[PDB]
Amino acid sequence: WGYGKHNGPEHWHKDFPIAKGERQSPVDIDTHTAKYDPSLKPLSVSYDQATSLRILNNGHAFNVEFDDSQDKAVLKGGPLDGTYRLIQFHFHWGSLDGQGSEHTVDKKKYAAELHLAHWNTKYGDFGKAVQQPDGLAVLGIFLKVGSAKPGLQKVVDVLDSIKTKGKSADFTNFDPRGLLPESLDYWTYPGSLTTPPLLECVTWIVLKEPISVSSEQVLKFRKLNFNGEGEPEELMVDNWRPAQPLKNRQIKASF
Ligand SMILES: [Hg+2]
Ligand SMILES: [Zn+2]
């Protein structure tokens, strides 16, 4: 699988039949159809004690991994029941600024989309939670081109180091709080992972308010490679999946 003409999202169903499931992600968020639910509690992000370990290029994106042996960086409240631990974060970007995000808003596509993956700590480990309907919690944040994001420069600088597939780099003392918008207003719905195995275990939380990053920050993302060192060079762009049918599911709003 990949995002190429021959291995793209339109071919995933072949190896991952769930691709055509009932709670597939990403989706289009119709703001006029989303339902204001007053029983929704405010989001609770506790990332003051976070511990980043490394940055890796897995051939489809770059992941910033965290130590999840303890409740260092946790997500609770909102639509969630119990505590979710931050395992990693990554992005999805496009070739141009008109595309990149996975979720859309009234059909509108952003430059990129940031995903912070969490797993329910009653299941004990990541591998076990992916076997549960409420196993994961993904915090989605849209990225628009404007002013630089100071809190994001550190990631940008280390990309040169992990240009190709398989490369990894030590990445400690990175505070994720720097990637968060002012507002914690969100939309929530039952979905899946947007990449294979596409397991239908995710509780999506997409923030209304986007973060802006500079043209130059975003440009460095696009210099990454899908291919491994020594192979023909294939630029890492458009690593996003097209919106899926909501199919009965209802999108709730915290605002
Ligand atoms: Hg699941
Ligand atoms: Zn993602």
Total beta strand runs: 15
User: Which fold name is given in CATH as the topology?
Assistant: Carbonic Anhydrase II
Distance separating the two termini: 38 Å
Provide the helix percentage. Answer: under 10%
Largest beta-sheet details: 13 strands, mixed
If helices are DSSP runs of H or I spanning 4 or more residues, what is the number of helices?
Answer: 3
Bound molecules: mercury (II) ion, zinc ion
Q: Which geometry do the CA atoms define?
A: globular
Spell out the CATH superfamily. Answer: Alpha carbonic anhydrase
Number of domains: 1
Quaternary state of the chains: monomer
How does CATH name the architecture?
Answer: Roll
CATH top level class name: Alpha Beta
> What would you report as the Rg, rounded to the nearest angstrom?
17 Å
Instruction: Give me the secondary-structure category.
Output: mainly beta
How much strand? Answer: 25-35%
What string, H for helix and E for strand, traces the elements in order?
A: EEEEEEEEEHEHEEEEHE
Modified residues (Phosphoserine): 161, 168
GO molecular function: arylesterase activity; carbonate dehydratase activity; cyanamide hydratase activity; zinc ion binding
Site (Fine-tunes the proton-transfer properties of H-64): 3, 58, 63
Organism: Homo sapiens
What does this structure look like?
It is classed as lyase(oxo-acid). The entry lists the keywords lyase(OXO-acid). With 255 residues, the protein is mainly β. Helix content is 7%, strand content 29%. It is built from three helices and 15 strands. Zinc ion binds next to strand 7.
